[PDB]
């Protein structure tokens, strides 16, 4: 009568649905697929990440959009403007980076 | 005797804690919040980051 009675997954009758699908996965990869449901995580965890994917995990990141621009390489004139003060204190100095300084700014940046 | 087993999952006696629940669980997310602890990688694997998930 023999001497094991080999039980299968499907009788455990107090398991989950997820529960179930990982007792019955068979590599980590496999395993991961069932766990993460964001695509982009997903594809961080693989070590295989698309454009797409990063731009998006980049979303997940970061708040700052002005940041973010720089982070895609791809900058706007306002992303710029948002940029240099995150880079440059200097009021004058701000005015130059722009191209278009004031009046007041050309004096200042003279002087200086 | 009924061939058909129902076996709980307490009854799997050498299943470690984490296994057992895992076993339980329902749904990815639910799989999640067992596995990852640090609470901001949990929050970018779940795609919802505040500001301080994402600063640290």
Known sequence: ??????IEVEDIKDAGDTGKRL????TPSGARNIIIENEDAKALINGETTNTNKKNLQDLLFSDGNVKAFLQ???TDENKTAL???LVSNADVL???SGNPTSDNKINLRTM
């Open 73 to 75: 390489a791809t900058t």
């Open 1 to 6: 009568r023999s001497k094991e009675i080999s």
């Open 84 to 86: 240099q003060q995150l």
């Open 95 to 97: 005015g130059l980076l």
């Open 23 to 26: 007792l019955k996965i068979n």
